[PDB]
Amino acid sequence: EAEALAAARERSSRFLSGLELVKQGAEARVFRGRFQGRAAVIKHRFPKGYRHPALEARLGRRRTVQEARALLRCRRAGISAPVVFFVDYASNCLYMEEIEGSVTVRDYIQSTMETEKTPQGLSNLAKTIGQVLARMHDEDLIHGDLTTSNMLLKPPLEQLNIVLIDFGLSFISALPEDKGVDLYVLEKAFLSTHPNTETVFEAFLKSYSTSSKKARPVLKKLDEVRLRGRKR
Amino acid sequence: HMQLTHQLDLFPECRVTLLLFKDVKNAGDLRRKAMEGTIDGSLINPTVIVDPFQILVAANKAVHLYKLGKMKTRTLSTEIIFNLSPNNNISEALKKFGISANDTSILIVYIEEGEKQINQEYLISQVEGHQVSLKNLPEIMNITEVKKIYKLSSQEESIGTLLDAIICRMSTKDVL
Ligand SMILES: C[C@@]1(N2C(=O)c3ccc(C(=O)O)cc3C2=O)CCC(=O)NC1=O
Secondary structure: HHHHHHHHHHHHHHHOOOOEEEOOOOOOOEEEEEEEEEEEEEEEEOOOOOOOHHHHHHHHHHHHHHHHHHHHHHOOOOOOOOOOEEEEEEOEEEEOOOOOOOOOOOHHHHHOOOOOOOHHHHHHHHHHHHHHHHHOOOOOOOOOOOOOOOOEEOOOHOOOEEEEEEHHHHHEOHHHEEEEHHHHHHHHHHHOOOOOOOOHHHHHHHHHHHHHHHHHHHHHHHHHHHHOOOOO | OEEEEOOOOOOOOOEEEEEEOOOOOHHHHHHHHHHHHOOOOEEEEEEHHEEEHHHHHHHHHHHHHHHHHOOOOOOHHHHHHHHHOOOHHHHHHHHHHHOOOOOOOOEEEEEEEEEEOOOOHHOOOOOOOEOHHHOOOOOOOOHHHHHHHHHOOHHOOOOOOOHHHHHHHHHHHHOO
């Protein structure tokens, strides 16, 4: 077992040898390739020689396990998100469908505000984001790390087809305090990366609250989380 | 009457070969031989296969757990069938996704690793049936029962194919 496992992580590394690297983070590298004839993308949560391989072991596993159930939960709910093809729990790799020809919402918003020159043009996109996160939260699924770079825009761009990605920190909870804190981190994501887009966050919020049937208590806890800075 | 063979992308030492038969008369004898081990490969209900991708994903996860020694079933050829079920009921999985005594079309899947090959002309010789090419697989597959045995949704077909909804419960059932 101890020898066979080294082999299974050794095929992994070989397989990713010849693949284009598309996303890199503190926890995960994302390679682009093909998997049994389908356009796929492989998300490796690599170990770092910096800490105890006992703690690092479970950290890769939890993120991968949690992303795997989160993408299943969204497929069975009409929440659009990548399909998962294979999950290697020996190497913490996650083989999923590539969202071909898509662009992040972050570059759809610093591309629309350099030509339109006003945020007045973004209220349809905000409307649809409110609809997407409302039906997500309505199945008590907390994303965990909502930013405008974990939402993709599938072609055709005109119809605003939002695909959510990166669910490693996601989790199930019906607590409005948890949905509230989930929207707060998306709010701070707008603030840091997209200047002067504050009017865009209620075309979102007003959309969310007319699209999710339990949103009233979540927006009371959002305004309580905005006042405190955290959940407590 | 043509095979369809594909190479496993993460285990390029292996290949997966698919053979499909119509008008089978000895499905009952064929099943006993799988439990008895005489016949090589996995005998799968083609009624519920929507694309070879369904077979390869199952094949891939089976070799992976085979090579780690942590398979949930016994044979590799039985782990392939099990990995097609959306549940973890091993016995329910192999009745509903295997072949049964009064079936008329069966699908044979087998993996060969490296130089070691299977006597494919002895394998066909055991089936009292008309081997057809896998291009004929859509006209055997029944969506009314793909939806029943996979419990596919209203919402699930609204955001993608039914192959995607299937693949995406095959590949996560080991984590509930
Ligand atoms: C670059 C792009 N891509 C994904 O599809 C994807 C899927 C999941 C994740 C994730 O972090 O979970 C990240 C990504 C990602 O960046 C989008 C554009 C494109 O055309 N092809 C891609 O591979």
